[PDB]
Amino acid sequence: MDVNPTLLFLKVPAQNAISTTFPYTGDPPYSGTGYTMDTVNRTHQYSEKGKWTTNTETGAPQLNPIDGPLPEDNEPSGYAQTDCVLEAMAFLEESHPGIFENSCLETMEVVQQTRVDRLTQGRQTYDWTLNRNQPAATALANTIEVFRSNGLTANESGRLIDFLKDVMESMDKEEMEITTKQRVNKRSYLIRALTLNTTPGMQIRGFVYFVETLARSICEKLEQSGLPVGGNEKKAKLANVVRKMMTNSQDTELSFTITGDNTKWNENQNPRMFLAMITYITKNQPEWFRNVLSIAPIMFSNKMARLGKGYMFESKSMKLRTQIPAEMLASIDLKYFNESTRKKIEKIRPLLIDGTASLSPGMMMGMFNMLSTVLGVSILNLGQKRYTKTTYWWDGLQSSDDFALIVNAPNHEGIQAGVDRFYRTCKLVGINMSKKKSYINRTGTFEFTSFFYRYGFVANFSMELPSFGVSGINESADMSIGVTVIKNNMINNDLGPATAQMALQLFIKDYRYTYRCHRGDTQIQTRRSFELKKLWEQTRSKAGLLVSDGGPNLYNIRNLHIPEVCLKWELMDEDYQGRLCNPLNPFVSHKEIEMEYDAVATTHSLEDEQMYQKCCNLFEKFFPSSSYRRPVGISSMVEAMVSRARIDARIDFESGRIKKEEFAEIMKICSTIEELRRQ
Amino acid sequence: EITGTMRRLADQSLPPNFSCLENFRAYVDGFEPNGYIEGKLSQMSKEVNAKIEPFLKTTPRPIRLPDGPPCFQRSKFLLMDALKLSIEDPSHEGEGIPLYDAIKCMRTFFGWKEPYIVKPHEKGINPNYLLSWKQVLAELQDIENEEKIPRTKNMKKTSQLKWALGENMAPEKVDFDNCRDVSDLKQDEPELRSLSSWIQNEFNKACELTDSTWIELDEIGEDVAPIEYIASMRRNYFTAEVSHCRATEYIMKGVYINTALLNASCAAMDDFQLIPMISKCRTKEGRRKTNLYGFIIKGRSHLRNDTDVVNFVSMEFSLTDPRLEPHKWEKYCVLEIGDMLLQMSRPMFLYVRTNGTSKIKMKWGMEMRRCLLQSLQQIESMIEAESSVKEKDMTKEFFENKSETWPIGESPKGVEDGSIGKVCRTLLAKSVFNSLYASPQLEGFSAESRKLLLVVQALRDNLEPGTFDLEGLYEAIEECLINDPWVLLNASWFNSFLTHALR
Amino acid sequence: MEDFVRQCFNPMIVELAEKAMKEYGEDLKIETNKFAAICTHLEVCFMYSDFH
Amino acid sequence: MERIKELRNLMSQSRTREILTKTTVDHMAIIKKYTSGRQEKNPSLRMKWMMAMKYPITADKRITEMVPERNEQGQTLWSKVMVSPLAVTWWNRNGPMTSTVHYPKVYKTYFEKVERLKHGTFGPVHFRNQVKIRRRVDINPGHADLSAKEAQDVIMEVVFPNEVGARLTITKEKKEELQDCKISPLMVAYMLERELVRKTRFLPVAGGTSSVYIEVLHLTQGTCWEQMYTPGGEVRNDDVDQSLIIAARNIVRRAAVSADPLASLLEMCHSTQIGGTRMVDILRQNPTEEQAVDICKAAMGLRISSSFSFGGFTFKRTSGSSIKREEELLTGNLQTLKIRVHDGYEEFTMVGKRATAILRKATRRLVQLIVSGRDEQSVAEAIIVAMVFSQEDCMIKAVRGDLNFVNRANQRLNPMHQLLRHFQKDAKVLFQNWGIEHIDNVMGMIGVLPDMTPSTEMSMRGIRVSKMGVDEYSSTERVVVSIDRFLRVRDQRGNVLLSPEEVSETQGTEKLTITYSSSMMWEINGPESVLV
């Protein structure tokens, strides 16, 4: 006989065993420089309505398809009317009294209080200083130093808004010189400030963070928005909203639920529409607030897309290969390419400038997810049977692209009318609904961002099971971290108790293998097992020994929150406790701590990137409290440290014991540095 | 402030109805919801609609399958055809040096015939493979001259080995300034391969039980709570039904192989090191056994990035004639290398292939025991979701009750339901095959077929479902079906399911 | 900022600053720093005039 | 001298001295976050490769005179300062046994968990389709209700006294018991910050309110099950706010009777002391949301939650607006009443003592209502206050008798509170006069009859009593209040937010010692306290 796993769906419903369809646990091997051109040409495909305007400061032609011609065919179109978006915003604000003003006040508090720290906490970014992708902190330091080398030194006040002011005044300077040194002119600098990678630039990140904070403050006060919440919270927002629909009295209700998704949702959102909806949200607000929040949409309206590495040609006869970058696409003939490459290059030749293509109506994935969710919640709010003025009425939950709708109408004839109205209004605001990856049924069974509802719940949303392997930082820290991660995934990203048991089992196996500490009970011997077996032989109560010292495991579900030392503490030997918990050991030092737990004897271990770190470490060496709490003080680093040094020298010379000449030399060096800081 | 070169971009970002953005902001400030939505709807064409097309049991048509040349096997190592070479030796593990364990595997076999090669690669230098194998045997027997055993055999930079790893100098790196013009300076979509019969047999063998245990699952503390009792009774029954399965051997094999290769790709960054394919298990009588599936020769491993690829040659033992199914071994070259004592004395073959792997490809395969956890959760969900409607949950009726049978097979044109252990091993082997046969086609197929499955379920619950463009869904499904045997087997499975779902 | 000022000052200075900001239509939701400065000035004046 | 020498040779390079001279201390936090960020080279794999390597540990130089080079089998564990991991096990085997078993005073917060597990008697597992109840609970045992700033200001004093800020019983107790037995200042500081700082967050629970129930939430609650668990022995801060609640209730009750209630409330607040700390400071820094506590906070100028209180139930606006449109109405017993008729459509979520609900109400017409409570009389009270707020003429005509309800200060109540306090005691007329309709019992929704009996196909007009609880969404909002001289708080828009007339639903035990020292309160603590 032949074995077929999917046949199991014949006895068990789909939602009860849907986790069998998800093949991968984590991320599989994936796989460009041409793929960018495909997306660029597709974005300009849904926007070809003669709205070309040649840019004045970048010289790149720009499509402006907003409020253009209406769509005649069912194919996806990116032509959204401005007054429609503004009316959706107005009706959203009418349904929810003054939500925009509260969100705007919260965002004003954010922009007033935000330091430059929030700009370093991020993933890979695009450094224009080196024209390459770099980590967040390194790209930030590169931009800071290249600004400080020129006449741009406003960021040293600590405010992110001052860094944004520096970014503003940078585009006004005619030439920007980069030291490593060579000059760059204003045009190419504008190109580099408004160019993205396959990854935002360094300048746009502050404005995009502020816009995202505003969208977050808006989405927090919306039942129909499911982006800010995650996990069990989402569960409620499903079981609640369905109960607002299915539980209607006098059953004259026909409630149909659609599981939806918007195909090519990302490439149709025009940043000018975002500018419009922000301008309406910042209505009657102070002018500086609008001037700050509106920067990101303007930068996205005039933005370039970096192509990347390039292509590579191979000679079948001469046996020689050559690479061609993206910058050389202008001065080249079209004989060396196959038919598909030529077909893609022809439609993008007049768009590219300085090795980067021009993309006016574009928007990149994962940039304005929450503001896009606000836009979707607008149309979701337009179905309160008061703005439809008809018998059909809908409501639902919105995410970035995956949305779940529930529409009620008095008879089977009116449901399609409501669905068609919803779809056409989505087309009006630039939301192209996917007729392929969507389906309808009766209320009681649907999907929303991998959350499946069939008269019950299953949370296969973030069920990328945790790293069963060791975290690899330390002996006790790794065990505490692994068991705390298992405990967290048992409440946040719901998994069964037996799965958690087996996960702890695999983790303990990987932890005993990683640190060559299995136990003193097994015959297996690593480099370390002799000492472990000597321990096990001399220890009376074997259970008290830690797993890091070759001890037995007694962690289970009930005690995943207790650190290993405290759990086995009662069962330890007095000798073993004294030899383990001794703080006067030559093994540990107060470094790189932290949600981590107890620490014991098994707690062991631009110009130059560490320009800052040296200074910070020395300052911490002068004031230990700075390693715990953000320091407060108006004096400069040098004077504060010198005063600390002088006082410490005085106290450990007068009452303590230190050499008189050593004290003299210390204070001589201190006065030398005091004189040094005069220049 | 918004000064020039910034205000200039602001004025060029507004809709094509204004010149200064101040006019736009004043227009937005005073706005009148006079019902522009209804006007724009009255103006829009009536073709723009989400016309619901009903979904009854007649509309589902079985998934189309590609036709063409038979699909070959591209798994990194032999799954059912590989042959073990036991030493039943307690050297007790881990720090144990794997090179001498492999040579004492070789010490236990006799009957090494002169290599008479059988199935060629059909494109490439075939005798170089048997020359490389002879070099392997020679370098193995040539340790007694070294006077110091090396812990790692670094193969000579021989011509056959430079070719088998593709290190022979390729097109040289030049610039376009001097290769501006050559007559042939050109720069490819895959071919459509049809499903073959061997992948189903591979899966069937993957669900079978074996002789050994293949797991060392560590301990868990005392159970002093009812949910702890339930979790233990689930996990230990699963471990008992899954441990001796062949898919567990596959998991451990992949883990050991990828671990050895990645560990060698750090210290052997310059020379061709011989990497043995060693696994370890425990026989039925409770004695630890060390198995050798074959050898692997690694190329240059300057793995700076994670996607950087190192080439290798896998030479694996087998007892299957390639002449039985030659279409399966497209990327394989076969060497009939001996006869072994079985007393049938069947011929022992060596399947040698050249392949390439990256750091991420290796690490996705060192964590293959996730295939266990996934299975457990996809079991545990069914124990909870299907049994959430109960006061005292159904947990001991799921197991311990052989009357409950689940559909897993169709031999006689009819459903052949099996027991619980077959279900556990089927899900385990499915997850494992997804791990090693991982391909983006499989991901796309899962994503697109899950929707069709959910709508089939909504119809089966009599919830009057309907679609918009079923042809679009079918196009998306047919788009990710080209040449992968695993994806095509899953497609045939879904076709069987749709055939046996009253449709 | 706006909430913090209500902590480090007594309710009387807060009330007086709120009355004083209603002189020139100064909305305290925006001019938070002006509110803080006015509260500071009032408390300085009060601690200046007392006990003499 | 090594540090000042590093300052010297560091202040030499221009680009390394400009940073040290220009940047002040206040901004040091923003200058530490400038890293290379090369760290994530698969740290599990790196740790395995480093453990496979000989002598990967780093120690100081004092190991040379403390542990041997060769162990009892001749195995090396040194280098030249790298260390083999076997040396750690050696040090744990026969090393310096010391008297620092004193440990469980800094790590008290973990031994507390261990003790709660020791006597944590268990219970059965009643499987059910668990529905998440969105509560806001604290996750810290025994922290004395100290915020992050005022707790770190104590940490700095007890562990780094020579560099304290420019600014209390715990500050003495901890400084005393770990005076000279310090372990590691950063470790002690982190542990005391975990032990002493409060933290309240928005979590979905299914029966756990106290700190002891949330710390073990993964045991009790899961996907579709629940485990009855009792640790034994509560914590300090789940009943610290209760005494402040009782004090605020008594203060408001005594102020409402006074001539000028607002000034009385202010003086009593600034003079009352709760557990050694003055009341107004707690009010300024406490996240407890109660009606009398909001009255007290509004009397001194602090922000409260937009939620308005009616019938002891706090309301939250979900969607919809309204217009005032005052209107006159005649009762069912010939009584003229001028009323503020809530016009338009509105959606509300009302949280109560032991019952919550979701209401959808149009102009003088109740559209939909979903209620869930614990007691039968409690859901009855919820339904009564909801019917009173519904403003339908059905309950106006159901008024039986003249409405003359006065406050404890002999004050004419608003017509809303008149109807409420009338229907609150005897309401069986309104039920039999409201109306019955058919339901379908879907999504676990049952109906209620006039005799307070559940039914599967019959309910009141537009009503549903929900099983497995109503989802309680408690969103945080902070808007300035407009307190008046009679202790009534209104929004900036002009909507009466809260008033004293609904505060007293229980007496008060004051689980912690409370002290009133103003003038008017020296009669609650018996006549014997008057003299003292």
PDB file of C-alpha atoms in Angstrom, chain B residues 319-460:
ATOM      1  CA  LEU B 319      22.735  -2.367  -2.703  1.00  0.00           C
ATOM      2  CA  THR B 320      20.375  -1.073  -5.415  1.00  0.00           C
ATOM      3  CA  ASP B 321      21.098  -1.595  -9.089  1.00  0.00           C
ATOM      4  CA  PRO B 322      20.846   1.747 -10.934  1.00  0.00           C
ATOM      5  CA  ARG B 323      19.982  -0.313 -14.017  1.00  0.00           C
ATOM      6  CA  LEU B 324      16.618  -0.963 -12.339  1.00  0.00           C
ATOM      7  CA  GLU B 325      15.592   2.725 -12.363  1.00  0.00           C
ATOM      8  CA  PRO B 326      18.206   4.639 -14.384  1.00  0.00           C
ATOM      9  CA  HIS B 327      15.988   7.732 -14.637  1.00  0.00           C
ATOM     10  CA  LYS B 328      16.244   8.178 -10.855  1.00  0.00           C
ATOM     11  CA  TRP B 329      20.049   8.558 -10.865  1.00  0.00           C
ATOM     12  CA  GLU B 330      20.470  11.449 -13.274  1.00  0.00           C
ATOM     13  CA  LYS B 331      23.109  13.301 -11.228  1.00  0.00           C
ATOM     14  CA  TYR B 332      24.696  10.042  -9.984  1.00  0.00           C
ATOM     15  CA  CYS B 333      27.568   7.936 -11.323  1.00  0.00           C
ATOM     16  CA  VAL B 334      27.556   4.305 -10.188  1.00  0.00           C
ATOM     17  CA  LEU B 335      30.518   2.030  -9.414  1.00  0.00           C
ATOM     18  CA  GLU B 336      29.873  -1.648  -8.733  1.00  0.00           C
ATOM     19  CA  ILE B 337      32.530  -1.854  -6.034  1.00  0.00           C
ATOM     20  CA  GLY B 338      32.163  -5.325  -4.544  1.00  0.00           C
ATOM     21  CA  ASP B 339      30.124  -8.259  -3.323  1.00  0.00           C
ATOM     22  CA  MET B 340      29.156  -8.617   0.329  1.00  0.00           C
ATOM     23  CA  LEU B 341      28.327 -11.524   2.618  1.00  0.00           C
ATOM     24  CA  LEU B 342      24.569 -11.602   3.216  1.00  0.00           C
ATOM     25  CA  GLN B 343      24.162 -16.400   1.567  1.00  0.00           C
ATOM     26  CA  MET B 344      22.998 -14.497  -1.509  1.00  0.00           C
ATOM     27  CA  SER B 345      26.225 -12.443  -1.846  1.00  0.00           C
ATOM     28  CA  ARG B 346      24.558  -9.464  -3.479  1.00  0.00           C
ATOM     29  CA  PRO B 347      26.682  -6.863  -5.302  1.00  0.00           C
ATOM     30  CA  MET B 348      27.640  -3.740  -3.356  1.00  0.00           C
ATOM     31  CA  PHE B 349      27.488  -0.470  -5.303  1.00  0.00           C
ATOM     32  CA  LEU B 350      28.879   3.026  -4.741  1.00  0.00           C
ATOM     33  CA  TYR B 351      26.760   5.988  -5.850  1.00  0.00           C
ATOM     34  CA  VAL B 352      29.057   8.988  -6.397  1.00  0.00           C
ATOM     35  CA  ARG B 353      27.757  12.465  -7.161  1.00  0.00           C
ATOM     36  CA  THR B 354      29.164  15.982  -7.254  1.00  0.00           C
ATOM     37  CA  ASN B 355      27.092  18.598  -5.440  1.00  0.00           C
ATOM     38  CA  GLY B 356      27.424  21.871  -3.568  1.00  0.00           C
ATOM     39  CA  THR B 357      26.239  23.118  -0.185  1.00  0.00           C
ATOM     40  CA  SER B 358      26.280  26.397   1.718  1.00  0.00           C
ATOM     41  CA  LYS B 359      26.464  27.344   5.385  1.00  0.00           C
ATOM     42  CA  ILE B 360      22.703  27.896   5.647  1.00  0.00           C
ATOM     43  CA  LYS B 361      22.067  24.659   3.744  1.00  0.00           C
ATOM     44  CA  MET B 362      24.217  22.852   6.317  1.00  0.00           C
ATOM     45  CA  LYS B 363      22.664  24.463   9.398  1.00  0.00           C
ATOM     46  CA  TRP B 364      19.151  23.713   8.089  1.00  0.00           C
ATOM     47  CA  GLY B 365      19.797  20.030   8.637  1.00  0.00           C
ATOM     48  CA  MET B 366      21.786  20.252  11.833  1.00  0.00           C
ATOM     49  CA  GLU B 367      18.490  21.289  13.481  1.00  0.00           C
ATOM     50  CA  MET B 368      16.463  18.520  11.808  1.00  0.00           C
ATOM     51  CA  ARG B 369      15.195  17.263  15.172  1.00  0.00           C
ATOM     52  CA  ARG B 370      12.724  20.157  14.931  1.00  0.00           C
ATOM     53  CA  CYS B 371      10.855  17.734  12.652  1.00  0.00           C
ATOM     54  CA  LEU B 372      10.066  15.898  15.887  1.00  0.00           C
ATOM     55  CA  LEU B 373       8.637  18.926  17.713  1.00  0.00           C
ATOM     56  CA  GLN B 374       6.605  20.055  14.700  1.00  0.00           C
ATOM     57  CA  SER B 375       5.087  16.581  14.458  1.00  0.00           C
ATOM     58  CA  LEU B 376       4.264  16.629  18.157  1.00  0.00           C
ATOM     59  CA  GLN B 377       2.561  20.017  17.910  1.00  0.00           C
ATOM     60  CA  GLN B 378       0.613  18.984  14.812  1.00  0.00           C
ATOM     61  CA  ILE B 379      -0.404  15.943  16.827  1.00  0.00           C
ATOM     62  CA  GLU B 380      -1.029  17.919  20.010  1.00  0.00           C
ATOM     63  CA  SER B 381      -3.281  20.413  18.222  1.00  0.00           C
ATOM     64  CA  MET B 382      -5.477  17.505  17.130  1.00  0.00           C
ATOM     65  CA  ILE B 383      -5.537  16.264  20.722  1.00  0.00           C
ATOM     66  CA  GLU B 384      -6.753  19.694  21.883  1.00  0.00           C
ATOM     67  CA  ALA B 385      -8.638  21.397  19.034  1.00  0.00           C
ATOM     68  CA  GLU B 386     -10.564  18.254  18.073  1.00  0.00           C
ATOM     69  CA  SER B 387     -11.130  17.533  21.785  1.00  0.00           C
ATOM     70  CA  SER B 388     -11.733  21.067  23.113  1.00  0.00           C
ATOM     71  CA  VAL B 389     -15.453  20.161  23.249  1.00  0.00           C
ATOM     72  CA  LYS B 390     -15.234  18.035  26.398  1.00  0.00           C
ATOM     73  CA  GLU B 391     -15.303  18.471  30.173  1.00  0.00           C
ATOM     74  CA  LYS B 392     -12.647  15.840  30.979  1.00  0.00           C
ATOM     75  CA  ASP B 393     -10.537  16.104  27.844  1.00  0.00           C
ATOM     76  CA  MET B 394     -10.161  13.171  25.460  1.00  0.00           C
ATOM     77  CA  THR B 395      -6.460  12.339  25.789  1.00  0.00           C
ATOM     78  CA  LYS B 396      -6.308   8.617  26.601  1.00  0.00           C
ATOM     79  CA  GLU B 397      -8.937   7.825  23.951  1.00  0.00           C
ATOM     80  CA  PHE B 398      -6.733   9.382  21.255  1.00  0.00           C
ATOM     81  CA  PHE B 399      -4.011   6.846  22.038  1.00  0.00           C
ATOM     82  CA  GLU B 400      -4.643   3.415  23.615  1.00  0.00           C
ATOM     83  CA  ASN B 401      -7.711   2.881  21.359  1.00  0.00           C
ATOM     84  CA  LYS B 402      -6.918   0.975  18.160  1.00  0.00           C
ATOM     85  CA  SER B 403     -10.563   1.162  17.046  1.00  0.00           C
ATOM     86  CA  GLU B 404      -9.899   4.786  16.020  1.00  0.00           C
ATOM     87  CA  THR B 405      -8.340   4.538  12.545  1.00  0.00           C
ATOM     88  CA  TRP B 406      -7.128   7.372  10.326  1.00  0.00           C
ATOM     89  CA  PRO B 407      -6.987   7.540   6.500  1.00  0.00           C
ATOM     90  CA  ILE B 408      -3.344   7.287   5.445  1.00  0.00           C
ATOM     91  CA  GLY B 409      -3.325   5.210   2.264  1.00  0.00           C
ATOM     92  CA  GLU B 410      -5.102   3.978  -0.868  1.00  0.00           C
ATOM     93  CA  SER B 411      -3.816   0.704  -2.313  1.00  0.00           C
ATOM     94  CA  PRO B 412      -6.927  -1.090  -3.781  1.00  0.00           C
ATOM     95  CA  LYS B 413      -8.579   2.015  -5.280  1.00  0.00           C
ATOM     96  CA  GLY B 414     -10.011   2.383  -1.773  1.00  0.00           C
ATOM     97  CA  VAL B 415      -9.188   4.128   1.475  1.00  0.00           C
ATOM     98  CA  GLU B 416      -6.861   2.100   3.722  1.00  0.00           C
ATOM     99  CA  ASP B 417      -6.988   3.634   7.193  1.00  0.00           C
ATOM    100  CA  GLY B 418      -4.273   2.775   9.693  1.00  0.00           C
ATOM    101  CA  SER B 419      -3.543   2.976  13.412  1.00  0.00           C
ATOM    102  CA  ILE B 420      -2.132   5.828  15.502  1.00  0.00           C
ATOM    103  CA  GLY B 421       1.550   4.932  15.236  1.00  0.00           C
ATOM    104  CA  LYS B 422       1.320   4.973  11.451  1.00  0.00           C
ATOM    105  CA  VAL B 423      -0.104   8.503  11.737  1.00  0.00           C
ATOM    106  CA  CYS B 424       2.711   9.619  14.049  1.00  0.00           C
ATOM    107  CA  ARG B 425       5.411   8.176  11.789  1.00  0.00           C
ATOM    108  CA  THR B 426       3.692   9.564   8.679  1.00  0.00           C
ATOM    109  CA  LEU B 427       3.670  13.100  10.082  1.00  0.00           C
ATOM    110  CA  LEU B 428       7.268  12.714  11.272  1.00  0.00           C
ATOM    111  CA  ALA B 429       8.484  11.491   7.877  1.00  0.00           C
ATOM    112  CA  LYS B 430       6.462  14.211   6.137  1.00  0.00           C
ATOM    113  CA  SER B 431       8.161  16.904   8.223  1.00  0.00           C
ATOM    114  CA  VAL B 432      11.562  15.277   7.655  1.00  0.00           C
ATOM    115  CA  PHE B 433      11.094  15.065   3.879  1.00  0.00           C
ATOM    116  CA  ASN B 434       9.960  18.692   3.945  1.00  0.00           C
ATOM    117  CA  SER B 435      13.219  19.495   5.736  1.00  0.00           C
ATOM    118  CA  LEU B 436      15.602  17.716   3.359  1.00  0.00           C
ATOM    119  CA  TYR B 437      13.549  17.998   0.148  1.00  0.00           C
ATOM    120  CA  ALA B 438      12.963  21.662   1.049  1.00  0.00           C
ATOM    121  CA  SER B 439      12.285  23.704  -2.082  1.00  0.00           C
ATOM    122  CA  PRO B 440      10.472  27.021  -2.658  1.00  0.00           C
ATOM    123  CA  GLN B 441       8.064  25.088  -4.888  1.00  0.00           C
ATOM    124  CA  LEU B 442       6.993  23.148  -1.788  1.00  0.00           C
ATOM    125  CA  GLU B 443       6.466  26.400   0.129  1.00  0.00           C
ATOM    126  CA  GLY B 444       4.387  27.937  -2.657  1.00  0.00           C
ATOM    127  CA  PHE B 445       2.375  24.739  -3.075  1.00  0.00           C
ATOM    128  CA  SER B 446       1.611  24.589   0.646  1.00  0.00           C
ATOM    129  CA  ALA B 447       0.574  28.252   0.660  1.00  0.00           C
ATOM    130  CA  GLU B 448      -1.714  27.981  -2.367  1.00  0.00           C
ATOM    131  CA  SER B 449      -3.207  24.540  -1.636  1.00  0.00           C
ATOM    132  CA  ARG B 450      -4.021  25.448   1.978  1.00  0.00           C
ATOM    133  CA  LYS B 451      -6.655  27.875   0.682  1.00  0.00           C
ATOM    134  CA  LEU B 452      -8.246  25.239  -1.554  1.00  0.00           C
ATOM    135  CA  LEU B 453      -8.202  22.829   1.395  1.00  0.00           C
ATOM    136  CA  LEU B 454      -9.909  25.352   3.681  1.00  0.00           C
ATOM    137  CA  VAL B 455     -12.618  26.073   1.112  1.00  0.00           C
ATOM    138  CA  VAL B 456     -13.128  22.324   0.608  1.00  0.00           C
ATOM    139  CA  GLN B 457     -13.554  22.048   4.384  1.00  0.00           C
ATOM    140  CA  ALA B 458     -16.016  24.959   4.415  1.00  0.00           C
ATOM    141  CA  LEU B 459     -18.056  23.182   1.734  1.00  0.00           C
ATOM    142  CA  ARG B 460     -17.886  19.912   3.681  1.00  0.00           C
TER     143      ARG B 460
END
